[PDB]
Amino acid sequence: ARYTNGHLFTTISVSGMTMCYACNKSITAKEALICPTCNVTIHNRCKDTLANCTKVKQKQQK
Amino acid sequence: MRECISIHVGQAGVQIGNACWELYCLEHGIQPDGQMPSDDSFNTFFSETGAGKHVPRAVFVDLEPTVIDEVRTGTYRQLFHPEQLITGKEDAANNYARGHYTIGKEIIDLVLDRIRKLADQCTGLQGFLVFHSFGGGTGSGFTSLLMERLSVDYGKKSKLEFSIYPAPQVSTAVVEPYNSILTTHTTLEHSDCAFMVDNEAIYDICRRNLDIERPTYTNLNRLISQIVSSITASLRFDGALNVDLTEFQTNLVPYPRIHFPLATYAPVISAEKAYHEQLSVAEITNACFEPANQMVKCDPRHGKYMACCLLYRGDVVPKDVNAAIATIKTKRSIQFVDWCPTGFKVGINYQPPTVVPGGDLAKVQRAVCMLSNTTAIAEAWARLDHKFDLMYAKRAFVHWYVGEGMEEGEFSEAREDMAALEKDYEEVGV
Amino acid sequence: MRECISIHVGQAGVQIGNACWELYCLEHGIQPDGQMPSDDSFNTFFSETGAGKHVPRAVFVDLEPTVIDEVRTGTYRQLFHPEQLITGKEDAANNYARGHYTIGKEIIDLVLDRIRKLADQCTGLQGFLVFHSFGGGTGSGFTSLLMERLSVDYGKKSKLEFSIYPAPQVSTAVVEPYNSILTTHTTLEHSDCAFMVDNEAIYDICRRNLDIERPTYTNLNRLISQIVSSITASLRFDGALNVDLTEFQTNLVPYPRIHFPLATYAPVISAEKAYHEQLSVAEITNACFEPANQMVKCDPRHGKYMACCLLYRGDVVPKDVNAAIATIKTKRSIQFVDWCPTGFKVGINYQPPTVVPGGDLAKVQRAVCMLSNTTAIAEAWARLDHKFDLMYAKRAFVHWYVGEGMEEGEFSEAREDMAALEKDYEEVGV
Amino acid sequence: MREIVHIQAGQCGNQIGAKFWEVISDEHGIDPTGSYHGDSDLQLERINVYYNEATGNKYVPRAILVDLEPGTMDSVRSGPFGQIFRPDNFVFGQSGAGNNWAKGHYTEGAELVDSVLDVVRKESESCDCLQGFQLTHSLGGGTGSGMGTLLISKIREEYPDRIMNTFSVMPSPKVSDTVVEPYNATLSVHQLVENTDETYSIDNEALYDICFRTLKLTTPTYGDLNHLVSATMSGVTTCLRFPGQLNADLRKLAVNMVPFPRLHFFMPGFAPLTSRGSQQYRALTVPELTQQMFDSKNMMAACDPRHGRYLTVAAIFRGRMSMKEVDEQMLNVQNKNSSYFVEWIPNNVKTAVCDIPPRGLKMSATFIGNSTAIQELFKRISEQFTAMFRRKAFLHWYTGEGMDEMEFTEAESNMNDLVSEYQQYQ
Amino acid sequence: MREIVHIQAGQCGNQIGAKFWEVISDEHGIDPTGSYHGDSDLQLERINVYYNEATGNKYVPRAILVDLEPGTMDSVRSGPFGQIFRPDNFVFGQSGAGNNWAKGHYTEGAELVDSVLDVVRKESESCDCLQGFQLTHSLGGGTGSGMGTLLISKIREEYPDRIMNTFSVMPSPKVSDTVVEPYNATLSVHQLVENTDETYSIDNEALYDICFRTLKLTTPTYGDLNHLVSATMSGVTTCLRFPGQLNADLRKLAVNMVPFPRLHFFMPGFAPLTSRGSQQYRALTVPELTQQMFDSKNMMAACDPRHGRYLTVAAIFRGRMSMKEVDEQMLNVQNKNSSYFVEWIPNNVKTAVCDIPPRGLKMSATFIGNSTAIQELFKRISEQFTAMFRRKAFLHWYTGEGMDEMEFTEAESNMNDLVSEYQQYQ
Ligand SMILES: CC(=O)O[C@H]1C(=O)[C@@]2(C)[C@H]([C@H](OC(=O)c3ccccc3)[C@]3(O)C[C@H](OC(=O)[C@H](O)[C@@H](NC(=O)c4ccccc4)c4ccccc4)C(C)=C1C3(C)C)[C@]1(OC(C)=O)CO[C@@H]1C[C@@H]2O
Ligand SMILES: CC(=O)O[C@H]1C(=O)[C@@]2(C)[C@H]([C@H](OC(=O)c3ccccc3)[C@]3(O)C[C@H](OC(=O)[C@H](O)[C@@H](NC(=O)c4ccccc4)c4ccccc4)C(C)=C1C3(C)C)[C@]1(OC(C)=O)CO[C@@H]1C[C@@H]2O
Ligand SMILES: Nc1nc2c(ncn2[C@@H]2O[C@H](COP(=O)(O)OP(=O)(O)OP(=O)(O)O)[C@@H](O)[C@H]2O)c(=O)[nH]1
Ligand SMILES: Nc1nc2c(ncn2[C@@H]2O[C@H](COP(=O)(O)OP(=O)(O)OP(=O)(O)O)[C@@H](O)[C@H]2O)c(=O)[nH]1
Ligand SMILES: Nc1nc2c(ncn2[C@@H]2O[C@H](COP(=O)(O)OP(=O)(O)O)[C@@H](O)[C@H]2O)c(=O)[nH]1
Ligand SMILES: Nc1nc2c(ncn2[C@@H]2O[C@H](COP(=O)(O)OP(=O)(O)O)[C@@H](O)[C@H]2O)c(=O)[nH]1
Ligand SMILES: [Mg+2]
Ligand SMILES: [Mg+2]
Ligand SMILES: [Zn+2]
Ligand SMILES: [Zn+2]
């Protein structure tokens, strides 16, 4: 299906104060991606810039 | 002649039916209390009595009384036959084992009795329109219990289903994966074509197109009713290409087990937006193939279309359907499998879509309902079984099931079966 | 047939479009609400919907909601399609990086969808009418983002672009040179005919001819709208010499990159003045060639004319035109390049100019719009890059740009690229 | 149609039950006399759930009042709503418990249990479809902590299949009012873990915290604490008394909230809760409610849930709201606070919605949470008991009633088993 | 839509802010009670910028009030527009700062900051699209100079990309009211230079000068000074609340005004300003309002601009005027006074124009100037600091809260760095 860096990205309805996982900026639109394993959210414009799933999820476990 | 039996199970199915018969009464001009002021267009769904009263061909069942107590008190109290509104005593409590083995056991013999009485009034019965929810305790257990009997008593008759399917992120119960995984055996063995539907997809559609920020469940029901009305329009009305209910399955289903098509409707549009565009046949045809308009949260681009039925209704000319389908074919985004060079079934009906007076959906001279057997829906199952695997690894909530007369191994035997189904949709994708 | 898509970007572009669509609706007799009380003259700019309503072929985009919110509340609320009026969340803040890389990247996929749906309606599309400002953050970043996408999606179609350009003395922002020098890549690589205009020249025009001491931006927009209406007049109306949108470029553009003609209009005059003077063809033809009537503050005598397009509209006859250009050649002031002995493209249209009722432009039987590729415009670049060099020498304002995903080196590559363009406009001058 | 048998035990149980009947008779529009005076038909549609109809159009609550001292019966009977209860349902002895668990379980309450069950059987027999039992008591003291568990054992034996629902006010250290609470608590939890199907742990310190830091009452009395508990009491059973878009029976709650057989001790809460002087400024909409629920201050146990993770949460909304908003807020809560939910359950939030909000509120919502942080409440009591039992302090009063030290040791062993089980999945 | 979170700290900040709300609510047509009563729809179009909607159409100012003494809260709450604010945002301790920066930053304010950030987070979460922060404080004393900078550091850490906008009343030699002002100012600006994006320097001496030699007020009180400051407060945020011919967002102002990252300390001003007995004689035409703008007597800081040159100036007009007249007049000012502008920036003047003038005025305009001459204000305070620190006077009060002389040395070193940077270009 989709493994650009190595995980799923499915649409989520985004609200309130949020931040990209790569830009570390704020998302303005009401759309966002989300990996159910990595538990992140991105602009829809930084999908290829992230690391692979293994990197991000092993990072998330600090 | 050309009758259909519409059974409604679970709260979701019962409320969808409450919307659906509301739509039909407006369609055929029948009053909410069952009379008809002034063709046999109503003969498919309504049986006629000597007093001028049209009684629906429906059976409402729920093991708890609340929803059917509401319908027995609502505006449509006078529409239904009193003894086809069947109620139990104990709520299924979101448990497949209760709905199938213990509490749904008692009420099944009366439900099949009423179905038999409805059937005996038919001259040319064609199939069944079962409405239920995958997550619900009654919506899984009772539908399995009922279908195991229906497949042996009326085996030849086709059986069409309309199912609300668990979503990626939206979820209203914790054991939804178990309940769906147990409903899979019914939908595999004793079914012919079942239509998945997802709440979050319609939520996003209503947010984007209808411009309502926060809809209730009635809005979802008023679109699912529109879809089923579009399916049955060829059966209730005249048309250029009337699609029979068995012709329908013969086009949709390539293999015995591959029968889980997506459904979508167009033009889903508000009343304010509609004044500023034309809604030609080409535009509405292109609308169905966007990911923005699918009623299941899955990307069609990640799979291959296998078979698409376009049911046009209203002021549609077949020239336009031809030109639209050619335009669809030239696109390299909409990919079909190599072994189905034909692809598209087309039906055209002369009845425009009816707007519910309190509804939001605009009036349009045309409508197209697109149903697509496609491989992308496999990813919708690859989601849900992965939700199961985490829980059964811990034997998380199993004691409630096993405690109510269920065998433990049925879990594994269920998980195996979907592993065969999810394989097959990939296996035919080559 | 013969359609054009009008995209308006930035506050300046949006307000110019507000003037332009006000000028077109009166020219074709369309009410502000889109209806037509009573010939396919409007077909180029307006799409016609079965209710008898004309919807303009336009896309309004601004990354801050203010200006388009005024458009959505003003008198032309009912004219535009509500969904093609696109608004973002955050202001570009006069920053090329914010418009191009950071904020506009979210809305580009929506504006391209709007443009695609507009194009799918168009049967005989020719090109694009992009209105924007070089000084603005949106008007520089978003146009750069959008033109690159259009040049790959619709590479064959023409792309006419209309611009407000920084002036010698008058200016409203500090980093206008940065935005302009960054926009120069877009104009060079993905455009075919960009029409420079500046505020100071039109101000001086209103002071001298229209006898208004202190006008607003609306007065300038009511002249820019007149210029573009004169350009499209050959397309929307019958004429003796109808100039096609591609023929127009074929006569204007001698080399791939020399595509920045000046524009001017005549007779710009007040209602009081015109009664005292005749305004025959010869005098208006002369009126185009003085330094006073240029819309960019440069002296045409300093640069050799390369190509001129005289678009006459109204009660004009070819005899008088040929007589007037005979004198314009006879002059020693209206100089020309040795290698273009034809020089003058002529178009004639039978429709007189339309006067807006609240405007301060007089009614006149004849009008002429002169659009001239000439070397003198190089001086205008020799101005603005010198404004860049002082600031970029200190890295005066750079940290805002680099803070929003912009590579520092792209500044030098921009300054390099303009050094090639100003060379070219000089290199052909020998 | 899904009837509930209510039982009061002990002073605290009797008081909270009396306030519960206050609240729900107000909901159903029942007069102090027992005569219906409500406005809507939905009040009377499911009146059989909590009341028995009797002639003259009177409604007697299906409540059983048990206490080993006549003082509490004289208090409730002379109270604002004392007259409603059936005089046959007042079962009481004379000599009090003396804050002794063994007195309640073996000597004083063992005589009266035979009378209590013979009444509870009558109310079960008059019922059309009994669903479960709704008991009120306290694990401190001797009457509730022992006698309510004895009655729990007997009812579990007689009705093995019905749901059993208990609401317990339990001891906290800083607000302790009796010396021997650890003994009674460790002896009562040993039964509650085994027989009861759910248990809603209520702590006085947390309700005082609600009264002070959220409500801003200057002098909160026990009546206000009982009001707060009765709010969630009426909240949880709302789905089987009014219509709704998502109906959740108590068994429906039990199936989704109880993963393993013994991890059923829940932490309740209520929203909205605002001071009188500040309600004019707030927007009651669903996002603000959802913010107010999952705040650690709003919950009714001293456990700060950030020291653990939720196995399951249940939000029972009442009022008119769109389902999209409710599900969106429930999704954002668990995904923004993903560290505080167990990741071996993919979805942790159950949602139910009813169309009748409380009288005076356009919307309300009851929070239930099964969290591992409850172990801290179950840890500290065990740490208290070890302080006393190590030196056998005050074991003479308990051993005089025939009780043994091996029972205390087994009770604490079961306590450590339960706290270990709650710790295992954290 | 470009929502702004406002915060008040210290007595001076709370006062000038309590005034800001009275003046910005005058431009919004909001009743003292919080009910809308304005004339035009344009007032209500962008009410969300500085307020939150609540039931009954009551608009509550998105404002956080912070102070270490209850007295200022008592005065503001009992003040004219006191009841408009939310009671919950009144976050305050008991013991005052005692005009000590260390108490504000380390000991007393460090306790309360955990409370203030949680309310700021609530306001930020309720917002649709937040743009930046609008803090009012004074660099004198201990409450403002310490706690405002602590809060700025925290918010800058939590919201790195949002604008931070402070308005600073800062010391002057001849109008000093506290002995330890230089220490507090030196420790506060050492934070402001690093964290803030736009800091507007205000001085009481210049405010008195405007009151005396422009307004001809005989007895100007502190209320008049707060009025004068609040004029520019309302002026700068005009473009994102009303329609205009040239819209200038605060980020647009920042992108145009701040050449290098640390040279962002601006000098405000306002026009027109006339005595009540002489307004009948003036013509309010653009040139006349702009004639007063660039007069050295009209700006709000003691720095006479004639000892320096302007990096950038921003003129935000309000009312109906022609664009050509505006452009001519700004060209003439910077051409005839070319010696007072840096030549390495070719154009120094940003112009913004709003279509809606202030109530009661036909025309108005707000002036911002980033001038090198501001160094004289940062120089003189340092010259005071070096007077005391060289003999360690009053240092025991600061080291008693855990502070060190090394911090004072780095604060002074950073001050010298800032003044050197401002001087390097002049
Ligand atoms: C205008 C207005 O807002 O009035 C409210 C009110 O001011 C507030 C503060 C009420 C008020 O509650 C309290 O003051 C209170 C004090 C101690 C303990 C518990 C409550 C109220 O008394 C409580 C009362 O609640 C009800 O009527 C509910 O139906 C409640 N029943 C009772 O309180 C009740 C009282 C006497 C006799 C019988 C019932 C209920 C709660 C849960 C389930 C079913 C019913 C209401 C509307 C209010 C007042 C009157 C001020 C609050 O109560 C509830 C449960 O909503 C406390 O915070 C909430 C939020 C409300 O805004
Ligand atoms: C007939 C006439 O000319 O009346 C004027 C006036 O006389 C003068 C002197 C006013 C007047 O201002 C003062 O007296 C004053 C005194 C001390 C400090 C500041 C002002 C006026 O009070 C001030 C008042 O201004 C406003 O209403 C503005 O909207 C202002 N808002 C407030 O002053 C205000 C007062 C109370 C409560 C709420 C708001 C404003 C300024 C900037 C941004 C937004 C709003 C006006 C028109 C006048 C009077 C009434 C005499 C002046 O004020 C302004 C900002 O216009 C002071 O010099 C100007 C020029 C005016 O000519
Ligand atoms: N679109 C839509 N979905 C509904 C509706 N009502 C319930 N559902 C869906 O049905 C799913 C849950 O199934 P249940 O409501 O438990 O169905 P049930 O058969 O009554 O289950 P039991 O109560 O245990 O017997 C959820 O995904 C709900 O979203 C409705 O009115 N409209
Ligand atoms: N003739 C005319 N020029 C305008 C108008 N509005 C703005 N401008 C000119 O446009 C230049 C500034 O460009 P901007 O207004 O910043 O364009 P923008 O895209 O909205 O800028 P951002 O908000 O940062 O995206 C200036 O030279 C103005 O003179 C107008 O209405 N008419
Ligand atoms: N919220 C509340 N708590 C009470 C009430 N009465 C007693 N309590 C508390 O709950 C505990 C119950 O103890 P108690 O019932 O008196 O002992 P018992 O009679 O032997 O069961 C007391 O220690 C008190 O801390 C009450 O009316 N309301
Ligand atoms: N414009 C204005 N200045 C004030 C006001 N009150 C005090 N000031 C001045 O600003 C400075 C603030 O000092 P202060 O607030 O008392 O110290 P803090 O409370 O510890 O922050 C004083 O020294 C005064 O010079 C006021 O109400 N308005
Ligand atoms: Mg159900
Ligand atoms: Mg703009
Ligand atoms: Zn990003
Ligand atoms: Zn991943």
Query: DSSP letter at C79?
Result: T
Report the candidate in D338, D330, D198 with the shortest Cα–Cα distance to residue D258: D198
Report whether residue C93 contacts ligand 4, using a CB cutoff of 6 Å.
Answer: yes
Cβ D188 under 6 angstroms from ligand 5:
no
Q: Which two tokens stand for residue B429?
A: 């994708």
Q: How far is CA B299 from CA A11, A26, B66, B378, in A?
A: 10, 26, 37, 11
Helices (H) and strands (E) in chain B, counts: 14, 13
> With b meaning 16 or more CB within 10 Å and e meaning fewer, what string describes D412-424?
bebbeebbeebee
Q: CA D285, D287, D288: angle at the middle one, nearest 5?
A: 70
Report the Cα C392 to chain-centroid distance in Å: 29
* Residue at token pair 């877009």: C186
Q: Between vectors from CA B369 to CA B367 and to CA B374, what angle results, nearest 5°?
A: 150
Measured in Å, residue D247 CA sits from the centre of ligand 7 at 7
The DSSP secondary-structure symbol of C295 reads: S
Beta-carbon count within 10 A of D56 CB: 8
Residue E387 at interface with chain C, using a CB cutoff of 8 Å: no
Number of domains in chain C: 3
**Crossing angle for the helix pair E323-336 and C199-208, to the nearest 10 degrees:** 110
Nearest to C54 by CA among C114, C121, C9: C121
3-state secondary structure of D23: helix
Distance from CA of D241 to the nearest CA of B (A): 9
**In angstroms, rounded to a whole number, what is the distance separating the alpha carbons of residues C176 and C137?**
9
Going by the DSSP 8-state scheme, the letter that residue C360 receives in this structure is S
- The pair of three-digit structure tokens given for residue E219, joined into one six-digit string: 């007895």
- CB burial class (10 A; 0-12, 13-18, 19+) of residue E138? buried
Helix, strand, or coil here: C193?
Answer: strand
> Distance (Å, rounded) from C-alpha C425 to C-alpha C414?
17
Residue the block writes with tokens 């009861």: D196
Helix, strand or coil for residue B262? strand
Q: Nearest CA to CA, how far is D342 from chain A (Å)?
A: 13
Phi/psi at C369 (5° precision): -110, 120
Three-class SS state of D107: helix
How far is it, in rounded angstroms, from Cα E387 to Cα D100?
76
Write down which residue in B376, B400, B421 finishes a domain: B376
Which residues on chain E are in Cβ contact (under 8 Å) with C170?
327, 331
Cis peptide before D173 (omega within 30 of 0): no
Residues B349 and B385 in one domain: no
Distance CA B139, CA B187 (A): 12
Residue D57, burial from CB neighbour count under 10 angstroms (0-12, 13-18, 19+): exposed
Across the interface, of B11, B171, B394, the residue whose CB is closest to D247 is B11
Of E4, E19, E8, the closest CA to residue E92 belongs to E8
- For an interface test with A, the pick among E161, E162, E163, E251 (most A C-beta atoms closer than 10 Å) comes out as E161
CB B62 within 8 A of CB B11: yes
| Maximum C-alpha span of chain B | 64
Burial class (CB in 10 A: 0-12, 13-18, 19+), B392: middle
* Residue C346, phi-psi category: left (phi > 0), alpha (psi -120 to 50), beta (remainder): beta
Do D14 and D72 meet the contact criterion of CB atoms below 8 Å apart? yes
The token duo for D295 is 């705040």
CATH number of E374-426: 1.10.287.600
- Is D196 within 8 Å of D136 (Cβ atoms)? no
Rounded Cα distance between E236 and E49, Å, is 13
C142, C236: one domain: yes
Nearest partner of C391 among C415, C367, C423, judged by Cα: C415
By DSSP bridging, strand D310-319 and strand D363-371 are antiparallel
Q: Which of B70, B148, B189, B247 is catalytic?
A: B247
D160 token code pair: 């093995």
Residues of E in contact with D280 (CB under 8 A): 56, 58
Q: Which residues contact D57 (CB under 8 A, 6 or more apart)?
A: D35, D36
- Count of CB atoms situated within 10 Å of the CB of D248: 26
Residues C342 and C219 in one domain: no
**Measured distance CA(E183)–CA(E100) in Å, rounded:** 9
Phi (first) and psi of residue B327, to 5 degrees? -60, -40
Does B256 lie in the same domain as B137? yes
C53–B277 C-beta distance less than 8 A? no
Closest ligand to the CA of A22: 9
Homologous superfamily of the D260-373 domain (CATH)? Tubulin/FtsZ, C-terminal domain (3.30.1330.20)
Q: Can you give the CATH number for the domain in which C146 is found?
A: 3.40.50.1440
Q: Is the distance from CB of C283 to CB of C320 less than 8 angstroms?
A: no
Residue D70 to residue D54: CA distance in whole angstroms: 27
Bond prior to D357 in cis (omega within 30° of 0):
no
Residue E313 in contact with residue E298, Cβ under 8 Å? Answer: no
Alpha helices in D159-301 (DSSP H): 181-192, 204-209, 222-236, 250-257, 286-294
Q: Which two tokens stand for residue C103?
A: 């904020």
Which tokens sit at C117?
């749906």
CB nearest to E125's CB, from A17, A24, A25: A17
Chain position carrying tokens 């930053």:
E105
In short, whether E288's Cβ falls inside 6 Å of ligand 2 is no
Determine whether C174 is exposed, middle or buried from the number of CB atoms within 10 Å of its CB (0-12, 13-18, 19+).
Answer: buried
Structural domain boundaries, residue C384: 377-430
Residue among E167, E141, E140 nearest E152 (CA): E167
**CB of C221 closer than 6 A to ligand 4?**
yes
What Å resolution does this PDB entry report? Answer: 3.4
The span from the CA of C355 to the CA of E154, in Å, is 60
B326 and B190 in one domain?
no
Please state, in angstroms and rounded to a whole number, the distance separating the CA atoms of residues E190 and E418.
Answer: 9
Cα D167 to Cα D34: distance, rounded to the nearest angstrom: 25
State how far the Cα of D270 lies from the Cα of D363, in Å rounded to an integer: 12
**Ramachandran assignment for B22, one of left (phi > 0), alpha (psi -120 to 50 degrees), beta (any other):** alpha
Distance C143 CA to ligand 8 centre (A): 13
Q: Which chains touch B (3 or more CB pairs under 8 A)?
A: A, C, D
* CATH number of the domain located at residue range(s) E1-259 in this protein: 3.40.50.1440
For atom 13 of ligand 3, the residue with the nearest CA is B136
User: Residues B398, B346: one domain?
Assistant: no
- Suggest the residue from D41, D45, D255 to mutate for an interface test with chain B (most B CBs closer than 10 A): D255
* Whether C64 and C171 share a structural domain: yes
DSSP helix/strand/coil, D373: coil
Q: Taking the CA atoms of E418, E421, E425 and E426 in sequence, report the sign of the dihedral they define.
A: positive
Sign of the alpha-carbon dihedral angle for C26, C29, C30, C35:
positive
Chain C partners of E258 at a C-beta cutoff of 8 Å? 400
Residues of C serving a catalytic function are: 247
Supply E401's token pair.
């809260």
Contact D255 B90 (CB under 8 A): no
Cα distance between residue E330 and residue E349, in whole Å = 7
Helix (H), strand (E), coil (C) string for chain E: CCEEEEEEEHHHHHHHHHHHHHHHHHHHCECCCCEECCCCHHHHHCHHHCEEEECCCEEEECEEEEECCHHHHHHHHCCCCHHHCCHHHEEECCCCCCCCHHHHHHHCHHHHHHHHHHHHHHHHHHCCCEEEEEEEEECCCCHHHHHHHHHHHHHHHHCCCCEEEEEEECCCCCCCCCCCHHHHHHHHHHHHHHHCCEEEEECHHHHHHHHHHCCCCCCCCHHHHHHHHHHHHHHHCHHHCCCEEECCCHHHHHHHHCCCCCCCEEEEEEECCCCCCCCCCCCCCHHHHHHHHCCCCCECCCCCHHHCCEEEEEEEEEECCCHHHHHHHHHHHHHHCHHHECCCCCCCEEEEEECCCCCCCCEEEEEEEEEHHHHHHHHHHHHHHHHHHCCCCCHHHHHCCCCCHHHHHHHHHHHHHHHHHHHHHC
Ligand 4 centroid vs B322 CA: distance in angstroms? 48
Do B388 and B372 lie in one domain? The reply is no
Are B386 and B350 members of one domain? no
Ligand 6 atom 3, closest CA:
E12
Residue at token pair 């909240």? D235
The tokens describing A21, both together, are 């996982």
Min CA distance, E47 vs chain C (Å)? 14
Cα-to-centroid distance, B219 and ligand 7 (Å): 20
Residue E395: burial class (beta carbons within 10 Å; 0-12, 13-18, 19+)? middle
Per 3-state DSSP, chain C is made up of helix, strand and coil in percentages (nearest 5) of 45, 15, 40
Q: Is D412 annotated as belonging to a binding site?
A: no
Chains D and C touch (3+ CB pairs under 8 A): no
Between helix D374-389 and helix D405-424 the angle, nearest 10°, is: 150
In angstroms and rounded to an integer, the radius of gyration of the C-alpha atoms of chain C is 21
Name B232's Cβ contacts closer than 8 Å, sequence gap at least 6.
B4, B44, B45, B129
d(CA E376, CA E384): 12
What whole-number distance in Å separates Cα of residue B337 and Cα of residue E64?
Answer: 62
CA within 13 Å, CB half, E38:
20
Provide CB contacts within 8 A for C271, sequence distance 6+: C360, C362, C363
Q: Whose CA is nearest to atom 5 of ligand 4?
A: C12
Give SS3 for B261. Answer: coil
Q: Are B404 and B326 within one domain?
A: no
Structure solved using which method? Answer: cryo-EM
d(CA D219, CA C324): 99
State the Cα–Cα distance between residues C14 and C21, nearest whole angstrom: 10
Phi, then psi, of D9 in degrees rounded to 5: -145, 135
**Distance between CA B217 and CA B222 in Å, rounded?**
9
User: What amino acid occupies position B349?
Assistant: N
What interhelical angle do B137-153 and B10-28 show, nearest 10?
70
- Separation of alpha carbons E363 and E322, rounded Å: 12
- Residue the block writes with tokens 């008394």: D241
Q: Name residues with Cβ closer than 5 Å to ligand 10, which is an ion.
A: A 7, 35, 37-38, 53
The identity of residue B241, as a single letter, is L
Q: Which alpha helices (DSSP H) does B160-263 contain, by range?
A: 176-189, 199-205, 217-236, 245-252
Maximum pairwise Cα distance, chain A? 30
DSSP characters for B29-49? Answer: T--TTS------GGGGTEEE-
Which residues in chain A have Cβ-Cβ distances shorter than 8 Å to D342? none
Based on the number of CB atoms within 10 Å of its own CB, is E207 exposed (0-12), middle (13-18) or buried (19 or more)? buried
CB contact under 8 A, B276 and C53: yes
Do E83 and E25 form a contact (C-beta atoms < 8 A)?
A: no
Instruction: Give the amino acid at C53.
Output: K
* Distance in angstroms (rounded) separating the CA atoms of residues D3 and D128: 7
Neighbours of B240 (CB within 10 A): 14
DSSP letter for D325, please.
H
> At residue B410, what are phi and psi to the nearest 5 degrees?
-55, -30
The residue extents of the domains of chain D are: 1-259, 260-373, 374-426
Q: Is B134 helix (H, G, I), strand (E, B) or coil?
A: coil
Q: List helix spans (H) across B121-162.
A: 137-153
Q: Alpha carbon E230 to chain centroid distance?
A: 8
Contacting residues of D for E55, CB less than 8 Å apart? 283-284
| Cis geometry, peptide bond prior to residue C267 (ω within 30 degrees of 0) | yes
Q: Helices D149-158 and D181-192: crossing angle, nearest 10°?
A: 10
Q: Which of D300, D14, D254, D301 is nearest to D147 (CA)?
A: D14
C-alpha B124/C-alpha B2 separation (Å) is 5
In this structure, what token pair is assigned to residue E332?
């003439």
Q: What is each CA distance from E286 to C203, C210, C215, in whole angstroms?
A: 17, 22, 13
**Residue E411 backbone phi and psi in degrees, to 5:** -60, -45
The rounded distance, in Å, linking the Cα atoms of D81 and C343 is 105
Across the interface, whether the CB atoms of C81 and B278 are under 8 A apart is answered no
Say how far apart CA C393 and CA C402 lie, in whole Å: 16
DSSP B304-361: -EEEEEEEEEES--HHHHHHHHHHHHH-SSS-B-TT-SS-EEEEEESPPPPPPTT--S
Strands D349-354 and D244-246 come out as: antiparallel
Helix (H), strand (E) at residue D389: helix D374-389
DSSP letter at D146 equals: I
Whether residue C333 is annotated as binding a ligand: the answer is: no
Residue C201 to residue C165: CA distance in whole angstroms: 11
| Pair B349, B398 in one domain | no
Residue C386 and residue C406 share a domain: yes
Q: CA-to-CA distance for A12 and E283, rounded, in angstroms?
A: 58
What are the backbone dihedrals phi and psi of residue D373, each rounded to the nearest 5 degrees, phi first? -60, -20
CA distance C159 to chain E (A): 28
Residues from chain A that touch B198, judged by Cβ atoms under 8 A, are none
